[PDB]
């Protein structure tokens, strides 16, 4: 059997403020510990990063559930998606809305549906049937954003959110969650819900999660085509330069992902200013933001 | 500069009713006798593909617009995608009702908005806005469509239609519409709208549109990896088999496909019982529904 491994990352953009350091700082930590934790005592490589990615949801500091940005009408829309690398099976869910976790919700579409995605009044009408409360328009929105859109109208980093684990049984699995971009369209769909773009996995290749601007993710398949470097020969490190690579120079696109291979070898990589970041294996965690920052702690 | 070649599908699914040969036939000739129409006046790709996908969503004979199969609630809602393979630009629409042509309302996500996919709501929202006719429910729906609900409410054929091109300046377009498969879960979303999933288009490779199981042709990004196999080397009929039968193998999904390559070579394939099909090239117009059955006839 293998040494389970959790990355979690935040948002593909611009430098983050010294006052928000520390919320970050302490997301991420809090977002891997959950992860590891599910790992530590046997769970699953979905289970983990659902886990992970539910965290980050609540904490109001990330771009996703909670603290997630205003489209044009000041209203949250989430997207997020699901996969489990063993036979590939999938969910996800665009343009939600009244939701306090969008990601849990796309792992109700993989597992209660014949489907792998669900938008908008449909994905509404099955979180009812299976349960999911409805919370007030303004347990979502904050007052970082409702500012960031009036200012929108007349250098950022929003914190788009993501993870990637390896389980005891050799199995991966990614989860991407979204509040998309500020003063998006109405319906707005980005890179987060699309299996390939915003995320992938298989066993017998690797996870990858992204963030970023969708619009580019979304043209490129930044997800899938890193893995198809990986089954290539090249290494985590050498894929992730290449697949982000190729998204600057054919679409001038920037940012980052979060990669695990099937045997273990992990990283974090970005071609934006900064990535928050986390990776928690071997009883240590490794947390990163601005490049060569990483530190490592022993873990819990 | 280049020979313009246009290849449409419709659905790679059950046997086609005698009662509906000729039927599909004069659908086929004449999506693809209109796409050719336009790359022979020097149009783009573009162009091309979407006049031919127009054409099948006109046509009550097939699964996309006018002829769209009914969800489990009795209603009409559709997907389309369409991309531009020089600067990699992109466009669709999820889960749109009561307009006329999805297809359409793609390209308008691609030219004429910073964004590539729009949904559901904000998809009939910004229809109005660019003043797309928003027609009665109704008149989408078909006797036969109100039968096939019924017998399921109380395996099959159902024509998801598409197109490639590459045209006389070198440039390759996908496009792919549908209204997806019967008594499906309200606001589902399947492949048709995914980029490298229902389709993809790249001049430094070709492009590809594809028919079948959705879910299926997500969970493997079906079209992406159709090309990277002639990234690899591979002819395009050997990587339309290697990418079919891997969905095959792999998920368990029956399928299709078009793909026509930057040299201007192409091939319809598929791996489910039948799939009808046309091409346009050089003055000459191919068709065929079943395998080893092809017929070839001046196109004046
Ligand atoms: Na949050
Ligand atoms: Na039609």
């Given at each position: 059997h293998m040494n389970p491994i959790v990355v979690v990352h935040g948002g593909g953009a611009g430098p983050i403020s010294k006052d928000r350091k520390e919320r970050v700082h302490q997301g991420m930590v809090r977002a891997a510990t959950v992860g590891y934790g599910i790992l530590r005592e046997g769970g699953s490589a979905v289970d983990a990063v659902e886990g992970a990615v539910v965290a980050l949801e609540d904490?109001?500091?990330?771009?996703?559930?909670?603290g997630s940005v205003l489209n044009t009408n000041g209203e949250v829309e989430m997207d997020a998606s699901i996969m489990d690398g063993k036979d590939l099976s999938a969910g996800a869910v665009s343009?939600?809305?009244?939701?306090?976790n969008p990601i849990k919700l796309a792992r109700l579409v993989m597992e209660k549906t014949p489907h792998c995605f669900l938008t908008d009044q449909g994905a509404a009408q099955f979180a009812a049937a299976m349960g999911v409360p409805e919370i007030p328009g303004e347990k979502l929105v904050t007052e970082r954003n409702k500012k960031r859109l009036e200012k929108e109208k007349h250098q950022k980093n929003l914190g788009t959110v993501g993870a990637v684990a390896l389980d005891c049984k050799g199995n991966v699995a990614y989860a991407t969650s979204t509040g998309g971009?500020?003063?998006?369209?109405?319906?707005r769909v980005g890179d987060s819900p699309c299996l390939g773009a915003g995320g992938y996995a298989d066993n017998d290749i690797g996870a990858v999660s992204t963030t970023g601007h969708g619009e580019s993710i979304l043209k490129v398949n930044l997800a899938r085509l890193t893995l198809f470097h990986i089954e290539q020969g090249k290494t985590v490190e050498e894929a992730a330069d290449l697949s982000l690579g190729y998204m600057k120079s054919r679409v001038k696109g920037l940012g980052g992902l979060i990669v695990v291979s099937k045997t273990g070898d992990w990283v974090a990589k970005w071609t934006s200013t900064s990535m928050p970041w986390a990776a928690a294996k071997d009883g240590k965690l490794h947390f990163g933001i601005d490049p060569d920052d990483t530190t490592i702690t022993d873990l819990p």
């Open positions: 904490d109001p500091e990330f771009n996703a559930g909670c343009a939600v809305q009244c939701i306090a971009i500020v003063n998006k369209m109405v319906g």
